[PDB]
Structure 1
Amino acid sequence: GRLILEHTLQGHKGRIWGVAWHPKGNVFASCGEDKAIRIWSLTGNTWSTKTILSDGHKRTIREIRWSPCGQYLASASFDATTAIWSKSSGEFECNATLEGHENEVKSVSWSRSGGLLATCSRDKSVWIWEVAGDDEFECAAVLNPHTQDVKRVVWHPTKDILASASYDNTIKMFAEEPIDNDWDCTATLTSHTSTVWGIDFDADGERLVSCSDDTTIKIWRAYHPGNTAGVATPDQQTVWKCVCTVSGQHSRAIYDVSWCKLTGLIATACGDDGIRIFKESSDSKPDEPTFEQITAEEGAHDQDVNSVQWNPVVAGQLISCSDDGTIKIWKVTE
């Protein structure tokens, strides 16, 4: 396997917590300790910072995600707000703030349609906002089933299903119920022995990969009522079972995982400063899959790797960022 560095960027001062691709694949955003958001356009073979979003947050910016239409950028901050950045006039301005969490906001994520936005916080809760209007958001659910700091929320690629990962070691799944359209938790995924830092769905939302402070990554499979594999399906809720636990490939906490929806490749970012790439083998049992490491870079960064994300358009292009103050753009070839 090939994991080849293409670019080393750095513009922020201090540590860089998140990187996020614009849906069109040609622009990305980065956020970090310095309370700014950098938007990087590409021209030629040169990535450079084309806009700097300062003064939107009073503390560390932890995570940013572009809305699926590319016109909105949400940023989640330790200051207990989520900023929504839109080019109204405009260049990029902060047109809405979603407050309500008591503590640091750790994660933000958009639904497939763009109509729903989720946040989670160190206040153990998960919030779901409805988008209706140009820059106006009303709250639709405040979900409290976690018992500790919630680290990450991500939406199903297709359906309006939301996944959250917690310091309480679990992962939860949410949907609307038909009668009283209320959002309720419909699953709890338990196998991890410590903080779940990262989750990400596979291409079609039938599988989920998690990573943990416990140094493992885990593949979860959704089993549905008419189940051929003999999996009990109580109350016809999809149940998620852990069908794979990749152990011993990670010496410190794994802080993020990304599951490429174009190639099915899986990428991890680790407190031991390495970036690892995994693929499902060709003879993989569906109910006990084998994922093996097809290339690694144990010296990817000089410090903790905090985030990885596959380009949603350029298959094999991977972006990472690190406590070491850099952003790196890689290309993977099998």
Structure 2
Amino acid sequence: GRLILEHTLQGHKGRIWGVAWHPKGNVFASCGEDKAIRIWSLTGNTWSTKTILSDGHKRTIREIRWSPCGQYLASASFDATTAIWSKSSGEFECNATLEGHENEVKSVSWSRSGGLLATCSRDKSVWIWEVAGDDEFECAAVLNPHTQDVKRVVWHPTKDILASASYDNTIKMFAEEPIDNDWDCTATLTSHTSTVWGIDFDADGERLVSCSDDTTIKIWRAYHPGNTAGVATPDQQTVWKCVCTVSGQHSRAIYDVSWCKLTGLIATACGDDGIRIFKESSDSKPDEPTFEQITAEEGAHDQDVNSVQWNPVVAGQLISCSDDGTIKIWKVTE
């Protein structure tokens, strides 16, 4: 396999934290240290910034995430707020602001349905919000299960399940009981020896990647009751198990991982400035899967690679950002 660099973008001033593809795949957004969000549209063969969003946050914007509808965008920043931007007038303005977190907000995520919004912060908490309209936002649950800084929140692709990665080396699943009408923690995943930075589900949603500060990525499989293997859940809820651990592939902490829903490829953003692509082996067993590194670009950036995101529309197109102040769009060929 080969990883090919297509474009390099330097819109922001300073380090760039997050990038995310629009569900149409022709537009992406980026946030960074400059406290500004840049919307990038593709005209011809060149990518360019069409709009610049400023003054929405007083502090650094860590992550931005598109709605499943793709109309409006939400940003988690260090000013303990999560801003909501909307293009109702043909131009993007900040209509609503979500406050409540005690410290810096680290992550946002949208559910598959699009009516649920989840945030996590350095206050060891994971919040879930309800969206009844653009003029209305209602807090659904405030959860404090994590003992340390919560790094990321990611929703399940097919179902309304929430996953959270934390500085406490653990991952936590969250599901709501129908009879109870309240959110609760489903299971706790404990195999990493250091901070869990990133998480991403596979296409169907029965598996999960996680990258951590321990320079390893792990594959988690969801086991429901009555599994053939023989794994039993003392509670009614499902349990996840570490069925694969890739080690020695990364020199430093892995800050982000993305699992493509079109190809099944896995990309990692490491602190050694390197992007690595992993693909599941052809004969890999469903209880002990084997993943092999097909291609990598050790000099993908001049500094730490902060985020990697596959394109939902264009198969094999990857985007990444780094502390060197660059956004790079890649094309992988198996």
Shared fold per TM-score greater than 0.5: yes
Query: Offset of 1:134 from its aligned partner?
Result: 2.0
- Once the two structures are TM-superposed, the CA of residue 136 in structure 1 deviates from its matched residue by 1.8
Deviates more, 1:150-159 or 1:126-135: 126-135
Q: Deviations over 1:113-164 (max 9, x none)?
A: 1010000000000000000012321000001000000000000001010000
Q: Which runs of 4+ in 1 moved over 4 A?
A: none
| Pair 1:213-2:213 in alignment | yes
1:236 Cα deviation (Å)? 2.9
Alignment deviations for residues 165-219 of structure 1 (CA, whole Å, 9 cap, x no partner): 0001000000111212100001100000000000000001100000000100000
Deviation at 1:280? 0.3
C-alpha displacement of 1:256: 0.1
Displacement of 1:85 after TM fit? 0.6
Q: What are the within-5 Å matches in structure 2 for residues 1-334 of structure 1? A: 1-334=1-334
**C-alpha distance in 1 between matches for 2:319 and 2:199:** 17
CA deviations over 1:203-259 (Å, ceiling 9, x no partner): 011000000001000000000112112111222311000000000000100000000
The answer to whether the Cα contact below 8 Å between 2:153 and 2:165 also exists between their aligned partners in 1 is: yes
Conserved 8 A contact 1:227-1:233: no
Q: What does the per-residue CA deviation read over 1:11-68, in whole Å, with 9 as the maximum and x for residues that have no partner? A: 1000000001111100000000000000000010110000001010000000000100
Counterpart Cα distance in 2 of 1:99 and 1:90: 26
* Contact 1:172–1:186 (CA under 8 A) maintained in structure 2: yes
Give the secondary-structure state (helix, strand or coil) at the position aligned to 1:96. strand
For the residue of structure 2 that corresponds to 1:235, the secondary structure is coil
CA contact (8 A) 1:256 1:306 kept: yes
Count how many residue pairs are aligned between Structure 1 and Structure 2. 334
**What is the distance in 2 between the residues matched to 1:314 and 1:136?**
34
Alignment TM-score, normalising by the size of structure 2? 0.99
* SS of the residue 1:234 aligns to: coil
Residue pair 1:309, 1:320 contacting (<8 A) in 2 also: yes
Range with bigger deviation, 196-205 or 223-232: 223-232
Residues in 1 aligned to 2:179 and 2:72: alpha-carbon distance in whole angstroms: 31
Please give the alpha-carbon distance, in whole angstroms, between the structure 2 residues aligned to 1:227 and 1:237.
13
Taking the aligned partners of 1:104 and 1:178, their CA distance within structure 2 comes to 32
Is contact 1:269–1:276 with CA below 8 Å preserved after alignment? yes
> Does the 8 A contact of 2:226 with 2:232 survive in 1?
no
1:266 to partner: Cα distance: 0.3
Identity %: 100
Q: Report the Cα distance in structure 2 between the residues aligned to 1:86 and 1:225, rounded to whole angstroms.
A: 43
Q: Distance in 2 between matches of 1:4 and 1:135?
A: 43
Query: Matched residues in 2 for 1:327 and 1:135: separation?
Result: 33
Could you say what secondary structure the match of 2:235 adopts?
helix
How far off its partner does 1:89 sit? 1.9
The 3-state SS of whatever aligns with 1:236 is coil
**SS at structure 2 position matched to 1:293:** strand
- Residues in 2 aligned to 1:83 and 1:148: alpha-carbon distance in whole angstroms: 24
CA distance in 2, matches of 1:202, 1:230: 23
Structure 2 SS opposite 1:34: coil
Residues of 1 paired with 2:78 and 2:135: CA distance? 22
Q: TM-score, normalised by structure 1?
A: 0.99
CA deviation string 1:266-305 (max 9, x = no partner): 0000000000000000010111100010000000000000
Say which is worse superposed, 258-267 or 226-235, in terms of deviation: 226-235
Contact 2:318 2:329 in 1 (8 A): yes
Q: Distance in 1 between matches of 2:134 and 2:171?
A: 32
